[PDB]
Design a protein around this ligand. Structure first.
Ligand SMILES: Nc1ncnc2c1ncn2[C@@H]1O[C@H](CSCC[C@H](N)C(=O)O)[C@@H](O)[C@H]1O
Length: 291
């Protein structure tokens, strides 16, 4: 089901939905890299695991236009909130909780030179991600890694401004130990729980939100999950909380020439199948400021 995130992302790139140069703000150079980084991740997946390649290859090509619209709003909806925070603050650090197979750090590191980034998943999850980034040549050059495994402890990658690491997020001891050594308190901090909290119980997820919000002074928490007032309540300690289902993001945040561009690639005869599905997915932004 991390494979559902990667299969969706490759189905959107193949049709043309992503990369959107308007919303994500990617040049012709960085849009050529966005497509070549994901496709080099799929080809490298075939080497280390032919079963994992078989699930992602069959799901990508069998994805319908409805499912590709939901992936397009999933990517540019989160990215839009990231770009507002990375322009208002230049020295920023990220903590993508449940990162999985996400490669938004690759374009984000080139655009913002003073951007730290921290990826966190299970031991079985980041072991496969680490092998793919160290094997592919284009993914090696972008992160500035040599083929050697000079990294150390649970830190599978640790080359300057990017750091991959294994950690059970349910175990709060491993999570806070990890954030002490790799991040800083006062530095502005985006936390990204993309399709993560649906796997955890309400006890462990609420402890993860209270502890991470506490350990940083200034920050923004972009979340995304299946199910909106009940979901947004979890971050009530933060004084400013917006919350919106993905049908509301489709109308409000997606501008007019973007609507015509997606219609030109694959026309979605009826917007009803898109509304029913996307009202059951949402997107939460939560900005808190200590001092
Ligand atoms: N307790 C836990 N500790 C660490 N990772 C977890 C976890 N529970 C779920 N995850 C991870 O959360 C991920 C959610 S799948 C979505 C992946 C990513 N957010 C994306 O959109 O591309 C999975 O890869 C899974 O391994």
């Amino acid at each position: 089901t991390d494979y559902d995130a990667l299969s969706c992302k490759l189905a959107a790139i193949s049709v043309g939905y992503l990369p959107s140069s308007g919303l994500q703000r990617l040049s012709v150079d960085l849009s050529k890299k966005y497509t070549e980084w994901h496709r080099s991740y799929l080809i490298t997946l075939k080497k280390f695991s032919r079963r994992a390649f078989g699930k992602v290859d069959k799901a990508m090509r069998s994805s319908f236009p409805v499912m590709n619209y939901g992936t397009y709003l999933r990517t540019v909806g989160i990215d839009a909130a990231i770009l507002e925070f990375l322009v208002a603050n230049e020295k920023v650090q990220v903590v993508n909780l449940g990162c999985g197979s996400d490669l938004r750090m690759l374009p984000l590191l080139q655009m913002f030179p003073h951007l730290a980034y921290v990826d966190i998943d299970y031991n079985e999850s980041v072991e496969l991600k680490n092998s793919i980034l160290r094997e592919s040549e284009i993914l090696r050059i972008s992160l500035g890694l040599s083929k050697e495994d000079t990294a150390k402890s649970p830190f599978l990658i640790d080359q300057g401004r990017y750091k991959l690491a294994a950690c059970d997020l349910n175990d709060i001891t491993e999570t806070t130990r990890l954030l002490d050594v790799c991040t800083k308190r006062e530095i502005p901090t985006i936390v990204i729980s993309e399709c993560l909290l649906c796997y955890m119980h309400n006890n462990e997820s609420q402890l993860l939100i209270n502890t991470i919000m506490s350990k940083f002074s200034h920050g923004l928490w972009i979340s995304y999950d299946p199910i909106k007032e009940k979901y947004a309540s979890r971050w009530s300690a933060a004084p400013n909380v917006i919350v919106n289902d993905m049908w509301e993001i489709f109308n409000a945040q997606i501008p007019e020439s973007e609507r015509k561009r997606l219609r030109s690639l694959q026309f979605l005869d009826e917007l009803e199948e898109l509304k029913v599905m996307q009202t059951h997915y949402i997107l939460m932004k939560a900005q808190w400021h200590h001092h």
